[PDB]
Design a protein around this ligand. Structure first.
Ligand SMILES: *[C@@H]1O[C@H](CO)[C@@H](O[C@@H]2O[C@H](CO)[C@@H](O[C@@H]3O[C@H](CO[C@H]4O[C@H](CO[C@H]5O[C@H](CO)[C@@H](O)[C@H](O)[C@@H]5O)[C@@H](O)[C@H](O[C@H]5O[C@H](CO)[C@@H](O)[C@H](O)[C@@H]5O[C@H]5O[C@H](CO)[C@@H](O)[C@H](O)[C@@H]5O)[C@@H]4O)[C@@H](O)[C@H](O[C@H]4O[C@H](CO)[C@@H](O)[C@H](O)[C@@H]4O[C@H]4O[C@H](CO)[C@@H](O)[C@H](O)[C@@H]4O)[C@@H]3O)[C@H](O)[C@H]2NC(C)=O)[C@H](O)[C@H]1NC(C)=O
Ligand code: YD0
Ligand code: CA
Ligand code: ZN
Ligand code: ZN
Length: 803
């Protein structure tokens, strides 16, 4: 109920919100159907239009007009944005040569530079270059300010997940808006694009920028705009707010445009009809900047121009139908489109089974345009699992395609040529970022980065303390002129032990054998130095990783590698080695095929044993440092120590062996040496975070040896590849993966083929950030470099995309 009998007289776009059942006048009262009777008359004036003409100059104030050209208009804060150009012979912002803003130049009574977020829906990254001819304002912002070639959105590359991620710094799995459409089994309620449940507080988690500002004493405009309010009225409302008195004036604002997403759906990303929406957006930017100039704020305000996701070519005829795969199609509910989420239709049907659903969707058609996953097996870079709103079964859909339940869903609901939502590393899904103003750098290109990182920066732009979020605070300090947040390395929690030789061979009863008994002052003193750390500078290039939790572990030195061995998990947490360009691959000699050797530095009670692997018919083992890369015949025996061994499924061994035998040497050649850090990850509860000892769901049968959910590697070299990995003076270059440790290779449909046709493809899909591995392991890498710490943070957020 709303008693709409109140008035918006002197209340137009009020900032505080008045509670029911009184009538509202804010920029969202339309969407709630709760505006006062006179809202349109008073607050949405349209008369005479949005521009001053020559004949309106010095007119007599007529309050009916959308905006004004009367002499009193500047004091009132309500001129049309081109008033000074027509009536005072001033020039448009876009026509001025751009001059570095070295110091904020703000009017008296402005305590901080204000921030304006200019958000544009569906603004594909390539529009910046391809549309630059018809976007002079946006192109001036871009080239004078700070820009990225693109910004990576979050998955799913939908509007609500991405807009709320921008506002919070959180993965959708954490903020709770995991799609445009959601079912919550605990509330037993659905969230829809169209309807009233989406207004409920309970859906929205974390702490968005406007709330963070408010709680810390920084005033905010209201970010959201009812569709029916024209863009020109949005721009004027923001400029009016900027003219309020100091104690009433907000410091942070947002504009939002439904374009170009809206037209993009109809016409495709580059439909010839897409030029006009792009002109229109640019005209709107021009109005803002012209408007700020009039207020003398154009060298004072920080402006962020930012998109939520891109747009792809997608038609009716590229739809896969689940009814061509499943017999029991009427037993399932599908959330359809550019991603698929499946659950049971009724809670009271016990003949429903996910195992059989996945199976029926798995590599069934030669050309299949989607792949099923249990949510925990999705690539960890997507971070899309740890929410009760994300259904257990997920379909990742190929760019350009749809999934639907039955064909009727598509012709009785072609209309559309564009869509988005796909995997967030797909090129067509990337979006834009440009910062312009006093706190941003001048004429600066920065590398691509992810939208989760912005909340932190926007908080810095405003002097705010960000709420806990998924950004890495400091990783974007290179966008900023000043206002840097200067982070410090986390302290190490566990220090390592350094075991010498403490055990005789006969103390071990591991069921292992090795033919190593075939046997020198000079050369024995020398391998002893190797065990004490003499070649650690070669193999541990950036310091040892810090363990950021309470645990018990040993550092183990060898000729060819170094590891941090956990006495709790009975395996290394990490193993580190360097492979130069000149290094040769050898094979595992005949006599050492089944060789496993006891490590006289580590008690039998802290070791794996071979018998458990003998007995467990599903489980085999593999090695973290690869024997294929041993520097010498004598060094090769080090690679067979029971402390270099890790549990692997025979199907996964296929993937790992190819990686270690072929790919590592390939990267060494291509990058001029590589440093490799490899290890296990235990994430049974799929929260992206290291599991503790009491959370391990699977052990090698009959033993306390835990089975990893994933294996990672981090592969570092010199950004300038004319310098070797082990002798790099400058910035570093990195790529990483987090390979799921699966008992079959069902994920890769061509796996019955040679590893050269499918293994590297699988790794690319599971590319990762060093930061991703950090959360999963509780380790901190790159502790000792010659690089600045902010630069290292940037390196840790880097994702190698292969697009
Ligand atoms: C990305 O970043 C985010 C944020 O940094 C990371 O997510 C955080 O991760 C933490 C660890 O996983 C987690 O700590 C929890 O906190 C539990 C209580 O949290 C509630 O309150 C939160 C704070 O709100 C206030 O925030 C500010 C301060 O900044 C205040 O000033 C305000 O006044 C605010 O009110 C709140 O954010 C949180 O909301 C979540 O849950 C709601 C759903 O009910 C959603 O609305 C919302 O979207 C959040 O939902 C996400 O997170 C939850 C997990 O919390 C998850 O279920 C969802 O899937 C979704 O992803 C809460 O309302 C606290 O209870 C926890 O302590 C338990 O576990 C520990 C384990 O050590 C035990 O010691 C302890 O006993 C306790 O266990 C008890 O309960 C168990 C289960 O019932 C039981 O087994 C046991 O026996 C015990 O009884 C723990 O400390 C943060 O909540 C979380 N924050 C957010 C926003 O998500 C994330 O990890 C990062 N991701 C990556 C990959 O790095
Ligand atoms: O104008 C906006 C958004 C502006 C904006 C600007 C910057 C942002 O990013 C950041 F953080 F970087 F600044 C994020 C958003 N929108 C967003 C899309 C939906 C939201 N909505 C709703 O009806 N609801 C969504 C939210 C909300 N608040 N109160 C009710 C409702 C329901 C209708 C519709 C209006 C237009
Ligand atoms: Ca976990
Ligand atoms: Zn969108
Ligand atoms: Zn859209």
């Amino acid at each position: 109920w709303t008693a709409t009998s109140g008035s918006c007289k002197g209340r137009c776009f009020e900032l505080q919100e008045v509670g029911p059942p009184d009538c509202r006048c804010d920029n969202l009262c339309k969407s709630y159907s709760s505006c006062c009777h006179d809202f349109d008359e008073l607050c949405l004036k349209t008369a005479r239009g949005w521009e001053c003409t020559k004949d309106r100059c010095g007119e007599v104030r007529n309050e009916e007009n959308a905006c004004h050209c009367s002499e009193d208009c500047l004091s009132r804060g309500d001129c049309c944005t081109n008033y000074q150009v027509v009536c005072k012979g001033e020039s448009h912002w876009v026509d001025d040569d751009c001059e570095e803003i070295k110091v904020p130049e703000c009017p008296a009574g402005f305590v901080r530079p204000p921030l304006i977020i200019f958000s544009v829906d569906g603004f594909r990254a390539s529009y910046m270059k391809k549309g630059s001819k018809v976007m002079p304002n946006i192109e001036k912002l871009r080239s004078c300010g700070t820009h990225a070639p693109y910004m990576r959105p979050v998955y799913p590359t939908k509007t609500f997940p991405n807009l709320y991620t921008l506002a919070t710094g959180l993965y959708p799995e954490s903020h709770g808006i995991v799609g445009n459409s959601m079912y919550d089994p605990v509330f037993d309620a659905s969230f829809h694009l169209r309807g009233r449940e989406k207004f409920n507080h309970r859906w929205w988690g974390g702490q968005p920028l406007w709330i963070t500002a408010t709680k810390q004493g920084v005033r905010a405009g209201t970010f959201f705009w009812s569709v029916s309010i024209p863009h020109e009225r949005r721009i004027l409302t923001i400029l009016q707010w900027l003219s309020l008195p100091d104690n009433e004036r907000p410091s942070v604002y947002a504009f939002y445009s439904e374009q170009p997403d809206f037209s993009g759906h109809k016409y495709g990303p580059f439909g010839p009809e897409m030029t006009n929406p792009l002109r229109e957006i640019d005209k709107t930017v021009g109005q803002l900047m012209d408007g700020l100039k009039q207020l003398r704020l154009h060298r004072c305000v920080n402006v962020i121009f930012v998109g939520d996701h891109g747009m792809e070519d997608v038609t009716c005829d590229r739809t896969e139908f689940l009814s061509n795969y499943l017999t029991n199609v009427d037993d399932i509910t599908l959330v359809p489109g550019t991603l698929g989420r499946i659950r049971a239709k009724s809670i009271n049907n016990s003949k429903y089974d996910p195992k059989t659903i996945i199976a029926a969707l798995t590599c069934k058609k030669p050309d299949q345009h989607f792949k099923p996953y249990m949510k925990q097996h999705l690539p960890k870079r997507l971070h899309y699992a740890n929410n009760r709103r994300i259904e257990d079964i997920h379909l990742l859909v190929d760019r350009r395609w749809h999934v639907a339940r039955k064909p009727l869903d598509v012709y009785k609901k072609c209309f559309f040529q564009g869509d988005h939502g796909f995997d967030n590393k797909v090129n067509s899904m990337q979006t834009v970022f440009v910062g312009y103003g006093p706190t941003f750098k001048y004429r600066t290109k920065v590398p691509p980065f992810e939208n989760i990182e912005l909340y932190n920066v926007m908080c810095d732009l405003l002097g705010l303390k960000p709420a806990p979020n998924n950004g890495t605070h400091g990783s974007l300090n290179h966008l900023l002129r000043t206002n840097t947040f200067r982070p410090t390395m986390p302290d190490e929690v566990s220090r390592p032990n350094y075991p010498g030789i403490m055990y005789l061979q006969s103390e071990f009863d591991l069921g292992c054998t090795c033919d190593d008994k075939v046997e020198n002052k000079l050369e024995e003193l020398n391998k002893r130095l190797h065990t004490k750390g003499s070649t650690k500078e070669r193999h541990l290039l950036y310091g040892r990783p810090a363990v950021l939790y309470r645990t018990s572990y040993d550092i183990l030195y060898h000729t060819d590698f170094e590891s941090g061995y956990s006495e709790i998990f009975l395996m290394p947490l990490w193993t580190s080695y360097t492979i130069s360009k000149q290094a040769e691959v050898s094979s595992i000699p005949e006599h050492l095929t089944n060789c496993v050797r006891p490590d006289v530095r580590v008690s039998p009670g802290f070791s794996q044993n071979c018998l458990a692997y003998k007995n467990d018919k599903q489980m085999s083992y593999g090695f973290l440092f690869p024997p294929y890369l041993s520097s010498s015949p004598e060094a090769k025996y080090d690679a067979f120590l029971v402390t270099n061994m890790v549990p692997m499924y025979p199907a996964f061994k296929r993937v790992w062996a190819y990686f270690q035998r072929v790919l590592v040497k390939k990267y060494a050649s291509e990058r001029n040496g590589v440093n490799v850090i490899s290890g296990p990850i235990f994430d049974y509860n799929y929260d992206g975070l290291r599991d503790t000892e009491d959370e391990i769901k699977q052990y090698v049968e009959g033993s306390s040896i835990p089975v990893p959910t994933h294996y990672y590697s981090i592969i570092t070299s010199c950004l300038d590849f004319t310098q070797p990995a082990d002798k790099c003076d400058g910035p570093l270059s990195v790529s990483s993966f987090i390979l799921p440790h699966r008992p079959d290779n069902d994920e890769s449909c061509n796996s019955s083929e040679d590893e050269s046709k499918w293994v590297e493809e699988l790794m690319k899909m599971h590319t990762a950030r060093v930061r991703d591995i950090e959360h999963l392991t509780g380790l901190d890498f790159y502790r000792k470099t010659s690089r600045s710490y902010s630069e290292i943070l940037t390196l840790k957020t880097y994702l190698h995309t292969y697009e």
